[PDB]
Write a protein that binds this ligand. Structure first.
Ligand SMILES: CN(Cc1cnc2nc(N)nc(N)c2n1)c1ccc(C(=O)N[C@@H](CCC(=O)NCCCCCCCCCNC(=O)CC[C@H](NC(=O)c2ccc(N(C)Cc3cnc4nc(N)nc(N)c4n3)cc2)C(=O)O)C(=O)O)cc1
Ligand SMILES: [Cl-]
Length: 159
């Protein structure tokens, strides 16, 4: 089973290359808890933004270009990425936008953090249809001394 996990600004704007304009360690904690001990599939921009292998996860980077870090696994196609994950209960696809578009048709679950941040940009999380998905968890948090913006964790399961 393949899941996508993403942090979305208003109107589902997501990162394209430069770091997103927020400071959300609680979102990073949610990401770490929902991805640890699972293989993670990412594109090259997300890899650069992470800046290091994510510990405790097989890191798989989908890129047309040769790999530049032997600490992680480099693949050139979607099927190669899935194969590198091997036989596990859940694959976490962690972005960026082209990777989400590639994997959404295969995915059964979305972990979304909806962030109340007005971020300008043309890159968006792919369209999902409101009703093709069951929202099974939702939990709101206000901005605080450590987190710049309010944020709502949601888990959806494909109908
Ligand atoms: C891009 N992505 C992709 C991404 C992101 N989010 C997503 N979210 C979702 N939902 N989904 C996705 N797919 C998704 N993808 C991802 C995905 C995952 C991850 C990922 O890491 N994750 C880890 C978990 C976290 C972790 O483990 N993260 C990090 C791990 C390392 C932590 C160990 C600490 C080592 C020390 C290093 N320390 C430092 O550098 C700071 C230096 C230090 N200072 C401070 O500390 C400090 C602080 C506050 C301060 N202030 C307030 C007051 C202040 C401020 N600024 C000032 N500036 C000026 N001039 N003047 C001031 N007076 C001033 N005052 C002042 C000073 C020091 O002075 O010594 C993990 O998944 O294991 C990352 C990216
Ligand atoms: Cl990417």
């Amino acid at each position: 089973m393949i899941s996508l996990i993403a942090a979305l600004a208003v109107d589902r704007v997501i990162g394209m290359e430069n770091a997103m304009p927020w400071n959300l360690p609680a979102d990073l904690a949610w990401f770490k808890r929902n991805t640890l001990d699972k293989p993670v599939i990412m594109g090259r921009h997300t890899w650069e933004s992470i800046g290091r292998p994510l510990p405790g996860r097989k890191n798989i980077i989908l890129s047309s270009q040769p790999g530049t870090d032997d600490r992680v696994t480099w693949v050139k196609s979607v099927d190669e990425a899935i194969a590198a994950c091997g036989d596990v209960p859940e694959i976490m696809v962690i972005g960026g936008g082209r990777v989400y578009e590639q994997f959404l048709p295969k995915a059964q679950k979305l972990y979304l953090t909806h962030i109340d941040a007005e971020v300008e940009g043309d890159t968006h999380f792919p369209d999902y249809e409101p009703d093709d998905w069951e929202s099974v968890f939702s939990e709101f948090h206000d901005a605080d001394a450590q987190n710049s913006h309010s944020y709502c964790f949601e888990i959806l399961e494909r109908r």
